[PDB]
Amino acid sequence: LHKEPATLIKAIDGDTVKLMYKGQPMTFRLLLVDTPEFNEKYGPEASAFHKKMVENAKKIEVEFDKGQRTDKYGRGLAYIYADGKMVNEALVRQGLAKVAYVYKGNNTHEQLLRKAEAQAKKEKLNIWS
Ligand SMILES: Cc1cn([C@H]2C[C@H](OP(=O)(O)O)[C@@H](COP(=O)(O)O)O2)c(=O)[nH]c1=O
Ligand SMILES: [Ca+2]
Structure with a gap:
């Protein structure tokens, strides 16, 4: 797998973001995770977390x-x-997302993310509190 450039257009919520990719605006859905919807518990906190991560990034x-x-x-x-830090993983690690929507053939980082979820759950963080 290969990292490719993009630029923030705008934060949307826990697991979706508007980016410019190859010069075109696109909404991205984060692979392998599910954040609560903004109106649900920890929804606002997921959104804020993702937003901060991407807004502060260079x-x-x-x-x-x-x-x-x-x-x-x-x-x-x-x-x-x-x-250089994965938003998908960072959300999971903080108990702000669950590993979810693991479809065969788009699941390269499954085990990395499940390891993060296990630690979040041990630490009883957010969702797992
Ligand atoms: C994360 C992801 C979601 N989806 C689809 C499955 C779900 O369909 P349904 O809309 O039929 O439930 C939906 C979940 O996204 P959201 O969690 O953003 O709603 O998006 C994929 O098809 N592939 C993926 O890798
Ligand atoms: Ca969601």
Whole structure:
């Protein structure tokens, strides 16, 4: 897998973000995670977390997996990095997302993320509190 450039257009919520990729605006859905919706518990906190990570980043990068790159809604499916740190993983690690939506063939970082979830759960963080 390969990291590719992109620039923030705007934060949306816990697990979606508007980025410019190859010069075109796209909504990205984070692979392998599920954040609460803004109106649900920890929804606002997920959104804020993602927002901060991406707004403070100097270098946003997009990493596609081996499978489908767009979902049925036209959202790009990727791992997103903010100054080299994966937002997908950081959400999980903080108990602000659950590992979810693990489809065969777009699941390269599954075990990395499940390790983060296990630590978040041990620490009883946020969702796991
Ligand atoms: C994360 C992800 C979601 N989706 C689809 C499955 C879900 O369909 P449904 O809308 O039919 O539930 C929806 C979940 O996204 P959200 O959690 O953003 O709603 O997006 C994929 O198809 N592939 C993926 O990798
Ligand atoms: Ca969601």
